[PDB]
Subunit: 138 residues, 4 copies
């Protein structure tokens, strides 16, 4: 392990606004928040360049009684057995379901999976979260 | 004063990767890049959400062997039994875990809960997704 | 009459496997084996559970392309929003899915809910696990 | 597809008790219930002989604040990344957690995993459910 210390200059008003926000959110300090920003930036780049394995979640909401969304979802997912690990389903109300799908694999593959799921007519709301396997981070 | 100068300490591996990336992008120095990361962060954390009823997911990744993240995560979650429905956990490798927490409640409280989770020491990365179970 | 004779139809693949197994065990005929399976079933479904508060899991496996199991499963689950907390789903192969439903409520109602799920046409196999969140 | 029809003789009182039970449970008919029994019997045998892949779930309940059960559980599970697919956790009350682990792999391996998890001091209740990948059934 090796820690590298360096200085940076940030616009004063920007910094002031930043400190006010992270405190409200709950961060213990500015250094921790900035390191978090740097990790986030690196994770995003990981989804852009390379073929390294990434991980993510796809959250969707739908009415299971509407059309054939339920069948369509299953068929799409079973087509990607290698990337989809598992999914959590919560029955919101008599008609609405919330489902979150955990995926692991190549970035381009996962983004296509999200495209197909989110573009389904029955899917009302949805969002792909791009994150990491943590293997290459800390 | 227009600029405030201060120092920060970062693991070398993490800094090497950061330097490589910002060099490719064409940034002239670390301060420009971090300034931009800070601005984007402020913008994302300024958007209003309201107080309606929302259902969401909080995705997080961490090394379960680091500090006390595992204990902190549980204690924090067990404080909000009413909003936290369930959580899914996937063991990525020997040390890393990915967890997805499903929540429901008033947008205001959900956002606050997510902030505490995502800012816990030990959490390497994470994102909140809030949605209204209503119509598209 | 001591014995009641009746017929049943079974896919040949399933029957071949059954025949192979009971032959190894030393059963003389299919009726002896099925008689034993029926007796064990009655015994397991006669044990009392009470009416205390329990938390459980219902594990099921099915071919999502068979009949209307997927629709039936959802409709049935959405009728008991109060007892069903969440469900985990794992896509085993092109057709088969494994699902685990977490429930909480009065032992009596939980057992009844599990029975309806496990007896739905299309469900290949499944088991209920009830426990009291109390002390060992 | 081929259906084979055959007759069987069951003790009359046993059969009567059986019909009464399956109706109460919700089965549409005796044939369906018996085929279910046969599938169950085959699945159990699958866990006894062979090396064929099986699937199961391990349900446990524990107080996360008690001793080191939480850390012990994670360490054990991360030791079997190949068999454990994912897990669902529900916070029961301020102190008690309910967790269900989905596993897939060889029978002997999964039973050992259950042994280790269930034998933990902090685990108050628990049960391994032996089921199938469905691949070899219908
Ligand atoms: Cl400063
Ligand atoms: Cl008859
Ligand atoms: Ni299908
Ligand atoms: Ni649902
Ligand atoms: Ni992979
Ligand atoms: Ni606690
Ligand atoms: Ni883990
Ligand atoms: Ni942090
Ligand atoms: Ni419905
Ligand atoms: Ni599936
Ligand atoms: Ni059946
Ligand atoms: Ni560990
Ligand atoms: Ni818990
Ligand atoms: Ni395997």
């Amino acid at each position: 392990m090796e820690l590298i210390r360096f200085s940076i200059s940030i616009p004063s008003k920007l910094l002031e606004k930043f400190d006010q926000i992270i405190e409200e959110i709950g961060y213990e300090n500015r250094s921790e928040a900035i390191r978090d920003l740097i990790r986030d930036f690196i994770i995003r780049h990981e989804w852009e360049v390379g073929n390294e394995e990434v991980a993510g979640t796809i959250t969707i909401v739908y009415n299971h009684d509407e059309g054939d969304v339920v069948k369509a979802l299953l068929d799409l997912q079973h087509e990607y057995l290698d990337e989809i690990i598992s999914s959590l389903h919560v029955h919101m109300d008599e008609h609405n379901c919330l489902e979150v799908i955990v995926v692991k694999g190549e970035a381009k593959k996962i983004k296509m999976i999200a495209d197909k799921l989110l573009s389904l007519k029955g899917v009302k709301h949805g969002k792909l979260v791009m994150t990491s396997t943590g293997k290459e981070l800390v």
